[PDB]
Design a binder for this molecule. Structure first.
Ligand SMILES: OC[C@H]1O[C@@H](O[C@H]2[C@H](O)[C@@H](O)[C@@H](O)O[C@@H]2CO)[C@H](O)[C@@H](O)[C@H]1O
Length: 137
């Protein structure tokens, strides 16, 4: 699986949908990013950063055409350079729930409300990708 990886969501996203990504962070990793795209927009951007002025952070946000909105920043950061990881996204009616290695990490309230239009996930950054899977209910 070559990264940047596009994972089609031809059904769009639906409540109860579960996306599971398995991989390994490369050595000396700078960033990871998951990008749920709807048309000209990024409905949900999940962006671990290994070094922003000597703190790890995960930045979350939504892009509407060329403009990023209000940043949500979170410090819980389970990833490590060289190490295997599992990221699970569960879609709920009012938010995306994100768990990393079987422990809950954050939730991100939908800003793009037409879930069925979110037709792709992009997986990029400093990772080897092993598998993807989702469940479309
Ligand atoms: O909000 C997610 C996007 O952030 C962008 O960088 C922001 C940066 O985090 C903030 O501190 C300030 O400098 O504005 C930057 C430009 O919007 C990234 O460029 C983009 O890729 C997203 O991760």
């Amino acid at each position: 699986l070559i990264v940047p990886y596009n994972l089609p969501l031809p059904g769009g996203v639906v409540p109860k949908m579960l996306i599971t990504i398995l991989g390994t962070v490369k050595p000396n990793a700078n960033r990871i990013a998951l990008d749920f795209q709807r048309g000209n927009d990024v409905a949900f951007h999940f962006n671990p950063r290994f070094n922003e002025n000597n703190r790890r952070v995960i930045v979350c946000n939504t892009k509407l055409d060329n403009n990023w909105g209000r940043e949500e920043r979170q410090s819980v950061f389970p990833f490590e350079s060289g190490k295997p990881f599992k990221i699970q996204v569960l879609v709920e009616p009012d938010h995306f729930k994100v768990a990393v290695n079987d422990a809950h990490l954050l939730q991100y309230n939908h800003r793009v409300k037409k879930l069925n239009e979110i037709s792709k996930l992009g997986i990029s950054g400093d990772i080897d990708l092993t598998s993807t899977s989702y469940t479309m209910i």
